[PDB]
Amino acid sequence: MIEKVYCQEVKPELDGKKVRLAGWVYTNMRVGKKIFLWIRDSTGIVQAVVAKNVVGEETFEKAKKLGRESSVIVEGIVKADERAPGGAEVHVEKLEVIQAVSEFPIPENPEQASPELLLDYRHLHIRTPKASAIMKVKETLIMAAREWLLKDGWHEVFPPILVTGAVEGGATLFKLKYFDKYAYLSQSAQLYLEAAIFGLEKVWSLTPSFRAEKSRTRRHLTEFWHLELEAAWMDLWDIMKVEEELVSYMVQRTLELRKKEIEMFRDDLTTLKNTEPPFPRISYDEAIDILQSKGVNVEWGDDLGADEERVLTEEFDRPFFVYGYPKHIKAFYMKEDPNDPRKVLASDMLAPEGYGEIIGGSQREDDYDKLLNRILEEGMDPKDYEWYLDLRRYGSVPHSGFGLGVERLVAWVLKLDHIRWAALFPRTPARLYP
Amino acid sequence: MIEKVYCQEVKPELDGKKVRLAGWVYTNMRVGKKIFLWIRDSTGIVQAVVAKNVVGEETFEKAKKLGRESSVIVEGIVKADERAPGGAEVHVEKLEVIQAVSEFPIPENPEQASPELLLDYRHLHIRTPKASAIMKVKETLIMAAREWLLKDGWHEVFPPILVTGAVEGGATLFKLKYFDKYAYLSQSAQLYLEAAIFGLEKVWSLTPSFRAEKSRTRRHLTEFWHLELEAAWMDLWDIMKVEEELVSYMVQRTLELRKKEIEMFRDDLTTLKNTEPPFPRISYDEAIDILQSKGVNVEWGDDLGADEERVLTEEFDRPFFVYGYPKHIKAFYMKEDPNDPRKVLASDMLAPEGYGEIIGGSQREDDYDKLLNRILEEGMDPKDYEWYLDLRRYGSVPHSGFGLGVERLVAWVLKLDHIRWAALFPRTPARLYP
Ligand SMILES: NC(=O)C[C@H]([NH3+])C(=O)NS(=O)(=O)OC[C@H]1O[C@@H](n2cnc3c(N)ncnc32)[C@H](O)[C@@H]1O
Ligand SMILES: NC(=O)C[C@H]([NH3+])C(=O)NS(=O)(=O)OC[C@H]1O[C@@H](n2cnc3c(N)ncnc32)[C@H](O)[C@@H]1O
Ligand SMILES: [Mg+2]
Ligand SMILES: [Mg+2]
Ligand SMILES: [Mg+2]
Ligand SMILES: [Mg+2]
């Protein structure tokens, strides 16, 4: 390959050097007698100056016709100039038009289009600066997670997607024909991580999880990226510490690296700066009391939906935990609170600013009889979970874990109006394409 | 949590120190008047010495009954002793039996069981040393990939799994009901990576890919982990360099870190040591000539199946490329060789020692008309690929990419007899459970 110079590399210190840009036309404007093409690539935008008396009439005329997203190779000499973007521009010697474009269907400012148009053209939308910014933030949060997980001694595993068990209820299961059998798409890798702790003790996975959720909210996708941890020996309080340490490191690392991207989306970084341990912790009992005190008609035992969480966040300026939920609005696998068996040892981590739940986790039931009984009480067939029950027969240990919704976290970090914008190609009940 | 000391931490230099082990009984043997329990955890095995006159009769009797996989907490004093495993043992002061076990259904040496028993009990099999070793090698190869990808300036993206397009043919597609519509499980994220290069230039993803492959071979799963790269500006030769640099770094890094694990599986590390650029490259034409020279009844235009690849590997002592395949045994998206349009600019990377294909990649067709025509020739509906065709309308650039089968790579690195052992919970046409 003939090497390119990235836009971010075009700096005043390269004054007088030859560079080869490769990218796409961002804007095309005649300035005096010259054509100024701003060329975008993955790293920034550079001003390329095209002079008729330098490139000749043929190239000059071609340059006039280059609309947004025209693919081009540009060779020229860098000139330091305090007036140009980045304090340096390229004086064009040669212009190769790969493909001229005049009708790119995403507007120059995407937010002047209907969100439905942007989704119809999601494959084109993702190359635009804000959409690309979201993907850079996403990769950085995940890289940060992997740094923390490696340093803290967790093992990465690669759990199954095709499964036969519901982890998070039958209502959100996708079912498919699988040769002579039927399979489900995994809602969560948790049950498999629980098997894996017996060999590896501290495990984690990042997998797509699948939820056939009919409700079309701004916090639900039908497919999302799910970062999940499970650890032998740890109780609920232990796993909550892991959660706050991990989330804080993810947020602080992304603040350090992606400030520019975050500032495209936020006027106020306060809640992100505030994201360091210890996070505030309230019981579900306290949550009910707070909600009732603000006039919300909620009763002990009621589910905390998105609206309840939203009101609860008003009292917090960083992520916070709610723990000790009523047993019967919580998953079959969660351990009872031994001090109060009406509750389970579960906690959710809620993001502030109205965002609500980003992590759900718990200590797991480690007693065989108790777990079997919960399976039966929930109308589940123990046959489908015999392997999971085996984990309580062959050297059971106390253990706990959690799942973080990556898109949910990105949506809070960037104050997105909908979780769909944090997925590369979002999936919702009416959206499968592109 | 009360902190534990890991087995690998029990070293002669801790002589006289109190430690708390937490783990599972590996073996239980009476030695003289004492009970020797070898305790395994995620990091190794430690000899714990239980003396009746120290722990008392009740604890001593309990210790006699502890079979393999009994979950235990052991507190005691480290004693340096050249005779013990690791040169240090723990003299037990306190023994807490969490759960006693006497009938763990995986044999002490798993390979004395039918592979079908091991798969029936896959959830139990994975905690055993060799199976756990494979997972450590897998996480290390992947960590190595991420190190290389970050250093070389690639962006991580998180592409969709629910899709409407076949990338790699209709025959291996899983189809499912999706609300009022139908969806497919992604065979490969490639088409979406191609969309993503327009914003991010150099992209990669690690995703589960799904192949409804009826043939039950030792190189096919119905679900596998697929590491895929796509890059703007790069041609086939460029992407081949990326492939050899990445694979070499993965292998060399895993050799550096996981020598102990690899030596459980290999007598000979030669081919791994040999895995550094430049890898040997032969044309498909040369491959046919080699095969015919060894008496294989293959003709130019024929598909190279597993058996052909196996024979071809006899001539190589490290991974190697085969390039320039006949157009009509290759995918619809691949770019024709401009020098010879009977061929496409595709290459596979084959592992030696009979293993064969670990990567398939190509330069992509970047001409709209040519791609449309190939879609139509293959009996595909261009409507299902309109978005993919858009990538050839709105600033097309030359580009290339590839997919690496992680399990396929693990199977070669560890000389596994079947790819299934490199998946945490393998999926094959008759195996969906556990
Ligand atoms: N390993 C575990 O302990 C996780 C546990 N099995 C689990 O799946 N919990 S969860 O349903 O709360 O999902 C966990 C998180 O996953 C996110 N989530 C959960 N459902 C969705 C949907 N439908 N869309 C997007 N994101 C979703 C959200 O952040 C939740 O807090
Ligand atoms: N992004 C790309 O350019 C990849 C391209 N779309 C692709 O899917 N190619 S491939 O079919 O050869 O699959 C790529 C690799 O994926 C592996 N593979 C491909 N199929 C399987 C099955 N069924 N089981 C396990 N592993 C499999 C094998 O290592 C192949 O070399
Ligand atoms: Mg809830
Ligand atoms: Mg939840
Ligand atoms: Mg082939
Ligand atoms: Mg192939």
GROMACS .gro file of C-alpha atoms in nm, chain B residues 63-356:
model
  294
  497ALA     CA    1  -1.145  -3.502   5.637
  498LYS     CA    2  -1.134  -3.880   5.571
  499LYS     CA    3  -1.464  -3.859   5.391
  500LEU     CA    4  -1.375  -3.576   5.150
  501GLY     CA    5  -1.383  -3.701   4.792
  502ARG     CA    6  -1.282  -3.524   4.473
  503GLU     CA    7  -1.449  -3.182   4.426
  504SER     CA    8  -1.541  -3.140   4.795
  505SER     CA    9  -1.551  -2.764   4.852
  506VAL     CA   10  -1.335  -2.660   5.145
  507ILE     CA   11  -1.181  -2.369   5.334
  508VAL     CA   12  -0.846  -2.456   5.488
  509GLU     CA   13  -0.651  -2.243   5.736
  510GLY     CA   14  -0.297  -2.336   5.837
  511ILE     CA   15   0.072  -2.257   5.849
  512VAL     CA   16   0.294  -2.285   5.544
  513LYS     CA   17   0.593  -2.512   5.585
  514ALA     CA   18   0.883  -2.520   5.337
  515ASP     CA   19   0.954  -2.881   5.241
  516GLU     CA   20   1.135  -2.991   4.926
  517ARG     CA   21   0.920  -3.305   4.918
  518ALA     CA   22   0.584  -3.127   4.888
  519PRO     CA   23   0.438  -2.998   4.559
  520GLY     CA   24   0.583  -2.653   4.489
  521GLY     CA   25   0.831  -2.706   4.775
  522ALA     CA   26   0.575  -2.593   5.038
  523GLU     CA   27   0.276  -2.750   5.213
  524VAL     CA   28   0.013  -2.621   5.454
  525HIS     CA   29  -0.011  -2.768   5.803
  526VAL     CA   30  -0.385  -2.755   5.863
  527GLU     CA   31  -0.512  -2.581   6.180
  528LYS     CA   32  -0.875  -2.546   6.073
  529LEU     CA   33  -1.085  -2.722   5.810
  530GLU     CA   34  -1.427  -2.596   5.702
  531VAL     CA   35  -1.614  -2.835   5.480
  532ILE     CA   36  -1.851  -2.635   5.262
  533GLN     CA   37  -1.980  -2.934   5.071
  534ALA     CA   38  -1.850  -3.291   5.083
  535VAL     CA   39  -1.859  -3.481   4.751
  536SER     CA   40  -1.793  -3.849   4.685
  537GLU     CA   41  -1.933  -3.912   4.335
  538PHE     CA   42  -1.801  -3.651   4.091
  539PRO     CA   43  -1.902  -3.799   3.751
  540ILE     CA   44  -1.589  -3.692   3.560
  541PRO     CA   45  -1.304  -3.942   3.613
  542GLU     CA   46  -0.970  -3.831   3.768
  543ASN     CA   47  -0.828  -3.855   3.416
  544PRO     CA   48  -1.115  -3.729   3.194
  545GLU     CA   49  -0.966  -3.899   2.887
  546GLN     CA   50  -1.063  -4.233   3.043
  547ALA     CA   51  -1.423  -4.137   2.977
  548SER     CA   52  -1.613  -4.145   2.647
  549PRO     CA   53  -1.598  -3.795   2.489
  550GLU     CA   54  -1.979  -3.820   2.485
  551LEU     CA   55  -1.988  -3.846   2.866
  552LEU     CA   56  -1.760  -3.541   2.892
  553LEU     CA   57  -1.991  -3.344   2.662
  554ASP     CA   58  -2.302  -3.469   2.849
  555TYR     CA   59  -2.133  -3.325   3.159
  556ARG     CA   60  -1.960  -3.035   2.984
  557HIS     CA   61  -2.048  -2.800   3.273
  558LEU     CA   62  -1.842  -3.025   3.505
  559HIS     CA   63  -1.574  -3.111   3.252
  560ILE     CA   64  -1.465  -2.746   3.211
  561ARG     CA   65  -1.337  -2.720   3.572
  562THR     CA   66  -1.079  -2.997   3.513
  563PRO     CA   67  -0.711  -2.898   3.454
  564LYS     CA   68  -0.672  -2.972   3.079
  565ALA     CA   69  -1.011  -2.826   2.990
  566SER     CA   70  -0.938  -2.518   3.205
  567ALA     CA   71  -0.593  -2.498   3.034
  568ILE     CA   72  -0.761  -2.466   2.694
  569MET     CA   73  -0.970  -2.172   2.820
  570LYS     CA   74  -0.657  -1.997   2.955
  571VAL     CA   75  -0.485  -2.038   2.618
  572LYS     CA   76  -0.801  -1.907   2.442
  573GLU     CA   77  -0.825  -1.591   2.660
  574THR     CA   78  -0.452  -1.529   2.612
  575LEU     CA   79  -0.462  -1.555   2.230
  576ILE     CA   80  -0.755  -1.309   2.231
  577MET     CA   81  -0.585  -1.069   2.475
  578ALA     CA   82  -0.281  -1.082   2.245
  579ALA     CA   83  -0.502  -0.996   1.943
  580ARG     CA   84  -0.641  -0.693   2.128
  581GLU     CA   85  -0.289  -0.576   2.219
  582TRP     CA   86  -0.184  -0.595   1.850
  583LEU     CA   87  -0.504  -0.434   1.725
  584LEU     CA   88  -0.479  -0.140   1.967
  585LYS     CA   89  -0.107  -0.084   1.893
  586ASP     CA   90  -0.168  -0.097   1.515
  587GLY     CA   91  -0.451   0.157   1.540
  588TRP     CA   92  -0.768  -0.049   1.469
  589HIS     CA   93  -1.106   0.043   1.615
  590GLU     CA   94  -1.328  -0.213   1.792
  591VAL     CA   95  -1.694  -0.220   1.687
  592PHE     CA   96  -1.992  -0.423   1.801
  593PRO     CA   97  -2.178  -0.539   1.490
  594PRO     CA   98  -2.529  -0.692   1.473
  595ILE     CA   99  -2.610  -1.059   1.521
  596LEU     CA  100  -2.973  -1.043   1.403
  597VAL     CA  101  -2.950  -0.980   1.028
  598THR     CA  102  -3.134  -1.016   0.696
  599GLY     CA  103  -2.844  -1.101   0.464
  600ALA     CA  104  -2.646  -1.414   0.399
  601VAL     CA  105  -2.272  -1.337   0.385
  602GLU     CA  106  -2.157  -1.694   0.337
  603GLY     CA  107  -2.446  -1.864   0.150
  604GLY     CA  108  -2.804  -1.971   0.226
  605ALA     CA  109  -2.720  -2.334   0.311
  606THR     CA  110  -2.574  -2.252   0.661
  607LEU     CA  111  -2.831  -1.990   0.769
  608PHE     CA  112  -3.032  -2.014   1.089
  609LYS     CA  113  -3.370  -1.843   1.050
  610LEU     CA  114  -3.598  -1.732   1.335
  611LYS     CA  115  -3.928  -1.559   1.392
  612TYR     CA  116  -3.873  -1.198   1.498
  613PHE     CA  117  -4.203  -1.039   1.604
  614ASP     CA  118  -4.395  -0.979   1.275
  615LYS     CA  119  -4.084  -1.054   1.070
  616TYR     CA  120  -3.811  -1.312   1.020
  617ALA     CA  121  -3.441  -1.276   1.098
  618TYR     CA  122  -3.121  -1.470   1.040
  619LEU     CA  123  -2.834  -1.532   1.281
  620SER     CA  124  -2.519  -1.362   1.147
  621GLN     CA  125  -2.271  -1.594   0.974
  622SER     CA  126  -2.005  -1.319   0.984
  623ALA     CA  127  -1.997  -0.947   1.070
  624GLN     CA  128  -1.809  -0.860   0.751
  625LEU     CA  129  -2.079  -0.666   0.564
  626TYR     CA  130  -2.129  -0.438   0.866
  627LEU     CA  131  -1.752  -0.390   0.913
  628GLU     CA  132  -1.747  -0.273   0.550
  629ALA     CA  133  -2.003  -0.005   0.639
  630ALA     CA  134  -1.798   0.089   0.946
  631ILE     CA  135  -1.466   0.150   0.758
  632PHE     CA  136  -1.622   0.465   0.605
  633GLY     CA  137  -1.622   0.632   0.945
  634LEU     CA  138  -1.340   0.451   1.124
  635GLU     CA  139  -1.110   0.324   0.839
  636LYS     CA  140  -0.957   0.028   1.029
  637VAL     CA  141  -1.213  -0.179   1.219
  638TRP     CA  142  -1.245  -0.512   1.392
  639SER     CA  143  -1.494  -0.717   1.589
  640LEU     CA  144  -1.506  -1.037   1.790
  641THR     CA  145  -1.856  -1.191   1.770
  642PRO     CA  146  -2.024  -1.529   1.781
  643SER     CA  147  -2.100  -1.639   1.424
  644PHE     CA  148  -2.367  -1.900   1.339
  645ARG     CA  149  -2.345  -2.174   1.076
  646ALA     CA  150  -2.623  -2.428   1.023
  647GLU     CA  151  -2.365  -2.677   0.897
  648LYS     CA  152  -2.514  -3.031   0.881
  649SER     CA  153  -2.178  -3.203   0.828
  650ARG     CA  154  -2.035  -3.315   1.165
  651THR     CA  155  -1.663  -3.261   1.110
  652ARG     CA  156  -1.384  -3.194   1.359
  653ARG     CA  157  -1.339  -2.838   1.217
  654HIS     CA  158  -1.701  -2.714   1.228
  655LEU     CA  159  -1.920  -2.582   1.504
  656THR     CA  160  -2.272  -2.436   1.453
  657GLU     CA  161  -2.163  -2.141   1.672
  658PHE     CA  162  -1.803  -2.013   1.685
  659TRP     CA  163  -1.606  -1.704   1.784
  660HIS     CA  164  -1.506  -1.502   1.481
  661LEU     CA  165  -1.237  -1.233   1.493
  662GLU     CA  166  -1.284  -1.014   1.187
  663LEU     CA  167  -1.090  -0.717   1.047
  664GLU     CA  168  -1.181  -0.476   0.762
  665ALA     CA  169  -0.968  -0.187   0.631
  666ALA     CA  170  -1.019   0.096   0.388
  667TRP     CA  171  -0.741   0.149   0.128
  668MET     CA  172  -0.591  -0.203   0.170
  669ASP     CA  173  -0.572  -0.453  -0.113
  670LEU     CA  174  -0.535  -0.830  -0.083
  671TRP     CA  175  -0.155  -0.818  -0.038
  672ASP     CA  176  -0.194  -0.554   0.229
  673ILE     CA  177  -0.452  -0.759   0.422
  674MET     CA  178  -0.230  -1.069   0.399
  675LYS     CA  179   0.049  -0.875   0.574
  676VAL     CA  180  -0.199  -0.775   0.849
  677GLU     CA  181  -0.303  -1.139   0.886
  678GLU     CA  182   0.052  -1.274   0.931
  679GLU     CA  183   0.152  -0.994   1.169
  680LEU     CA  184  -0.159  -1.046   1.384
  681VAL     CA  185  -0.140  -1.426   1.391
  682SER     CA  186   0.234  -1.422   1.466
  683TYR     CA  187   0.187  -1.177   1.752
  684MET     CA  188  -0.104  -1.387   1.893
  685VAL     CA  189   0.105  -1.709   1.876
  686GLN     CA  190   0.432  -1.558   2.009
  687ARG     CA  191   0.256  -1.375   2.292
  688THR     CA  192   0.069  -1.696   2.391
  689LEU     CA  193   0.400  -1.893   2.376
  690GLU     CA  194   0.554  -1.635   2.610
  691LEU     CA  195   0.267  -1.647   2.864
  692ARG     CA  196   0.113  -1.996   2.838
  693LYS     CA  197   0.411  -2.228   2.777
  694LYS     CA  198   0.302  -2.448   3.069
  695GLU     CA  199  -0.050  -2.490   2.928
  696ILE     CA  200   0.073  -2.551   2.573
  697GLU     CA  201   0.315  -2.824   2.695
  698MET     CA  202   0.018  -3.020   2.841
  699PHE     CA  203  -0.095  -3.061   2.478
  700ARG     CA  204   0.222  -3.062   2.262
  701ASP     CA  205   0.548  -3.258   2.261
  702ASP     CA  206   0.679  -3.032   1.985
  703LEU     CA  207   0.649  -2.651   1.977
  704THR     CA  208   0.840  -2.613   1.645
  705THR     CA  209   0.553  -2.497   1.421
  706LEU     CA  210   0.450  -2.240   1.687
  707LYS     CA  211   0.807  -2.108   1.722
  708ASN     CA  212   0.817  -2.089   1.342
  709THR     CA  213   0.508  -1.863   1.337
  710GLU     CA  214   0.664  -1.526   1.243
  711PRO     CA  215   0.634  -1.324   0.916
  712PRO     CA  216   0.679  -1.373   0.630
  713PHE     CA  217   0.452  -1.677   0.603
  714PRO     CA  218   0.495  -1.886   0.285
  715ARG     CA  219   0.252  -1.790   0.009
  716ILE     CA  220   0.141  -2.016  -0.275
  717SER     CA  221  -0.120  -1.957  -0.543
  718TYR     CA  222  -0.419  -2.181  -0.575
  719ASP     CA  223  -0.256  -2.285  -0.908
  720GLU     CA  224   0.054  -2.401  -0.720
  721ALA     CA  225  -0.172  -2.574  -0.461
  722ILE     CA  226  -0.338  -2.778  -0.740
  723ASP     CA  227   0.008  -2.865  -0.883
  724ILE     CA  228   0.137  -2.978  -0.541
  725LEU     CA  229  -0.177  -3.185  -0.479
  726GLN     CA  230  -0.163  -3.349  -0.825
  727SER     CA  231   0.209  -3.418  -0.770
  728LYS     CA  232   0.120  -3.614  -0.453
  729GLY     CA  233  -0.139  -3.818  -0.640
  730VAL     CA  234  -0.454  -3.628  -0.537
  731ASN     CA  235  -0.726  -3.633  -0.805
  732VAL     CA  236  -0.794  -3.261  -0.798
  733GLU     CA  237  -0.852  -3.040  -1.101
  734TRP     CA  238  -0.819  -2.664  -1.145
  735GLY     CA  239  -1.157  -2.515  -1.045
  736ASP     CA  240  -1.224  -2.775  -0.776
  737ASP     CA  241  -1.291  -2.678  -0.418
  738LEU     CA  242  -1.011  -2.747  -0.170
  739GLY     CA  243  -1.188  -2.942   0.105
  740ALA     CA  244  -1.048  -3.042   0.447
  741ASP     CA  245  -0.869  -3.348   0.296
  742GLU     CA  246  -0.696  -3.145   0.025
  743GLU     CA  247  -0.583  -2.886   0.276
  744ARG     CA  248  -0.453  -3.166   0.500
  745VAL     CA  249  -0.228  -3.306   0.225
  746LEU     CA  250  -0.116  -2.956   0.126
  747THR     CA  251   0.003  -2.885   0.485
  748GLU     CA  252   0.259  -3.168   0.453
  749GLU     CA  253   0.481  -2.925   0.262
  750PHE     CA  254   0.484  -2.653   0.534
  751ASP     CA  255   0.620  -2.609   0.886
  752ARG     CA  256   0.429  -2.289   0.983
  753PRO     CA  257   0.102  -2.119   0.876
  754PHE     CA  258   0.089  -2.037   0.502
  755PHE     CA  259  -0.132  -1.858   0.253
  756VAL     CA  260  -0.315  -1.989  -0.053
  757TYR     CA  261  -0.429  -1.704  -0.282
  758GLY     CA  262  -0.609  -1.639  -0.613
  759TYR     CA  263  -0.895  -1.888  -0.600
  760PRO     CA  264  -1.129  -1.962  -0.891
  761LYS     CA  265  -1.409  -1.703  -0.887
  762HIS     CA  266  -1.698  -1.952  -0.889
  763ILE     CA  267  -1.612  -2.146  -0.575
  764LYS     CA  268  -1.580  -1.819  -0.383
  765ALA     CA  269  -1.818  -1.570  -0.218
  766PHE     CA  270  -2.024  -1.313  -0.414
  767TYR     CA  271  -1.846  -1.009  -0.259
  768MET     CA  272  -1.491  -1.089  -0.361
  769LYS     CA  273  -1.303  -0.870  -0.608
  770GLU     CA  274  -1.196  -1.026  -0.942
  771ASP     CA  275  -0.828  -1.050  -1.014
  772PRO     CA  276  -0.789  -0.771  -1.278
  773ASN     CA  277  -0.493  -0.963  -1.430
  774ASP     CA  278  -0.709  -1.276  -1.461
  775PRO     CA  279  -1.086  -1.242  -1.408
  776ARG     CA  280  -1.125  -1.622  -1.380
  777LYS     CA  281  -0.984  -1.572  -1.028
  778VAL     CA  282  -1.072  -1.357  -0.729
  779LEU     CA  283  -0.838  -1.166  -0.497
  780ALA     CA  284  -0.898  -1.399  -0.203
  781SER     CA  285  -0.668  -1.586   0.025
  782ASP     CA  286  -0.697  -1.841   0.304
  783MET     CA  287  -0.440  -1.895   0.580
  784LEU     CA  288  -0.386  -2.263   0.654
  785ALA     CA  289  -0.231  -2.401   0.972
  786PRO     CA  290   0.026  -2.681   0.932
  787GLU     CA  291   0.015  -3.032   1.088
  788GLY     CA  292  -0.300  -3.126   0.896
  789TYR     CA  293  -0.511  -2.841   1.049
  790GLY     CA  294  -0.581  -2.637   0.734
   0.00000   0.00000   0.00000
